[PDB]
């Protein structure tokens, strides 16, 4: 259940390991998918079958007003649940500070961070996906 540099019988990789429901016959050491990468492995010290899946990842899109208008930006984690970006607290984007969140919002396009959701609709200014759009302005409804 944790991301690791695994090596089984010399087969190095990077992924998370889980108990399989799969039922390898005694002659099988590795299980495989449509890209011929190893999808599952039999643990040679105990003969248990482990599923291998790549550690969690996705695309990241950044939403900005005009840089002359402001430097502040919001970030969209593509296809990702907002229960999972707090687990993405090393990672490839080293600007960890956006994890401070507080205004985290789930779109069906992805988890959206740094933009505050508001009930009153507008014209679409920047398109997010799945009926959402984002814009830079003062709400100041109160």
């Amino acid at each position: 259940n944790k991301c690791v540099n695994f090596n089984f019988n010399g087969l190095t990789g990077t992924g998370v390991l889980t108990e399989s429901n799969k039922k390898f016959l005694p002659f099988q050491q590795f299980g495989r998918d449509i890209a011929d990468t190893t999808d599952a492995v039999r643990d040679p010290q105990t003969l248990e079958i482990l599923d291998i899946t790549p550690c969690s990842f996705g695309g990241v899109s950044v939403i900005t007003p005009g840089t002359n208008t402001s430097n502040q930006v919001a970030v969209l984690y593509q296809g990702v649940n907002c229960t999972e970006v707090p687990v993405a607290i090393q990672l490839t984007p080293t600007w960890r500070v956006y994890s401070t969140g507080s205004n985290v919002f789930q779109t069906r396009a992805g988890c959206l961070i740094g933009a505050e959701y508001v009930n009153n609709s507008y014209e679409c200014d920047i398109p997010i996906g799945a009926g959402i759009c984002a814009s830079y302005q003062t709400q100041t409804k109160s």
Binding site: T14, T37, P54, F57, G59, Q78, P127
Partner: protein, 49 residues
Amino acid sequence: VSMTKTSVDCTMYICGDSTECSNLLLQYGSFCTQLKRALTGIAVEQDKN
């Protein structure tokens, strides 16, 4: 009227997260950004159509 908006991370399709393959991929120049750009050009058009 439209087709499924698709994006590909070429540095992840081409190289299975290994750094040394990622350093060889830079030898090819901007090809991976052109693929990203062209697929983005299609994906922003589906919402125009």
